[PDB]
Amino acid sequence: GIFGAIAGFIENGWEGMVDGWYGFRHQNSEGRGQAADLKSTQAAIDQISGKLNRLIGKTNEKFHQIEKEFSEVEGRVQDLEKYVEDTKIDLWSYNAELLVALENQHTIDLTDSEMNKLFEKTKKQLRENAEDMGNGCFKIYHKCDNACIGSIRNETYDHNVYRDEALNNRFQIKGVE
């Protein structure tokens, strides 16, 4: 968690998602709904399954190799053959351990960043029409029906339409005393 969008301001995870990885949750006067962002999850899918593509498909065809098991004990050259084969295993053991360590850490940071930028992208769209609780939620001060919630969902929301209305509900509290 190098960005902070996972296990940071977000308390838990939404087990009720089957249509994507990252989604939204809203409640209006006309009802409550849920939907996921296809663009965000698709980007993280490419940068995760792509690592599988790099790992799988290596060409390392090897046919004839030195003997690695010995039924006898001869001396010097037998020791050298065992030492070479063992050294190759030891070097590749560290290569495998290092590779999985870097891939796992990068994957965790990649999904962490992919949702931190979704929060930033959404907040940029809403402008000063809303705010944040510090738990990932917003407060769209305009009287938003189902249409405008979905309009934000596929990245189309004219803030100037609800601009003067939201300012009343954010700054003009109790008629400024």
Ligand X SMILES: *[C@@H]1O[C@H](CO)[C@@H](O[C@@H]2O[C@H](CO)[C@@H](O)[C@H](O)[C@H]2NC(C)=O)[C@H](O)[C@H]1NC(C)=O
In the region spanning residues 108 to 167, those forming contacts with ligand X, defined by CB under 6 A, are 146-147, 150-151, 153-154, 156
Task: Of 46, 26, 27, give the one whose Cα is nearest residue 36.
Answer: 26
Cα 112 from chain centre: 5
Task: Annotate each residue in 109-148 with x if it binds another protein (CB under 8 A) or - if it does not, as one string.
Answer: -xxx--x--xx--x-------x----xxxxxxxxxx---x
Q: At what angle do helices 38-55 and 76-126 cross, to 10 degrees?
A: 170
- Cβ proximity to another protein, 99 vs 176, nearer residue: 99
151 part of the interface to another protein, by CB under 8 A: no
Measured N-to-C along each axis, helices 146-153 and 76-126 cross at an angle, to the nearest 10 degrees, of: 140
Q: Which residues of 106-133 are buried (b: 16+ CB within 10 A; e: fewer)?
A: eeeebbbbbbbebbeebeeebeebbeee
Pick out residues in 35-74 that bind another protein (CB under 8 A): 44, 46-56, 58-65, 67-69, 72-74
From CA 47, how far away is CA 68, in angstroms rounded? 40
Binding-site ranges for a second copy (CB under 8 A): 2-4, 8-9, 54, 60, 64-66, 76-77, 79-81, 83-84, 87-88, 90-92, 94-95, 98-99, 101-102, 105-106, 109-110, 113, 117, 120-121, 124-125, 127-128, 131-134, 163-164, 167-168, 171-174, 176-177
